[PDB]
Amino acid sequence: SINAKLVLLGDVGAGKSSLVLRFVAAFFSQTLAVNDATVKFEIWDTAGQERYHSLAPMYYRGAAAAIIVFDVTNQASFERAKKWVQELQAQGNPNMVMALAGNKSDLLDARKVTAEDAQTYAQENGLFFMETSAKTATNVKEIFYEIARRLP
């Protein structure tokens, strides 16, 4: 019923590929069902390396949703995620549904980014934060469903 382009954003090693692979490659069509309605996601992966940063607007143009992924064990990945958020808000459609995915939550000894910082950031910027694990499947299905729930 509802067709939506979803862009995935995040620097290398955050878990961008692992997450879409656990959920379902650089491109996927994925159909979900919420509340008597159908959502078919077109999912666009993007290159997360800094040298390719200026190319991303080509990919996130017209997107109805974005998952911005970071690695909770890597503070720089969180800094990168915040910049994506600012950019999408400066230069993306105000209607876009943004999800902040905090990946590799299963990793205990290694965690460097608190849920408070991430949650607080998300709350002040009109998005939602969700801890995920591709490894254990925690919140992988849910984050895509929560996007599809929120689509206008």
Ligand X SMILES: Nc1nc2c(ncn2[C@@H]2O[C@H](COP(=O)(O)OP(=O)(O)O)[C@@H](O)[C@H]2O)c(=O)[nH]1
Contact residues for ligand X, defined by CB under 6 A: 10, 12-18, 103-104, 106-107, 133-135
**Phi, psi dihedrals of residue 106, rounded to the nearest 5°:** -60, -20
When asked if residue 87 is in the footprint of other proteins (CB under 8 A), the reply is no
Among 136, 148, 66, 139, smallest CA distance to 102 is for 139
State how beta strands 37-44 and 27-34 pair: antiparallel
Q: Which does 73 bind (CB under 5 to 8 A by kind): other proteins, ligand X, none?
A: none
Q: Which residues pair with 41 in a beta bridge?
A: 4, 30
Tell the smallest beta-carbon distance from residue 73 to other proteins (Å).
17
Contacting residue, 35, 36, 58, 109, with other proteins by CB under 8 A: 58
Output 14 or 122, the one with its CB closest to other proteins: 14
Taking the C-alpha atoms of residue 99 and residue 109, their distance in angstroms, rounded to an integer, is 25
Beta strands in the chain (DSSP E): 2-9, 27-34, 37-44, 65-71, 97-103, 128-131
Site string for other proteins, 17-46 (x = CB under 8 A): xx-xx---xxx-x------------x-xxx
Pick the binder of other proteins from 32, 41, 48, 147 (CB under 8 A): 48
Q: Determine, following the binding rule CB under 8 A, whether residue 108 of this chain makes contact with other proteins.
A: no
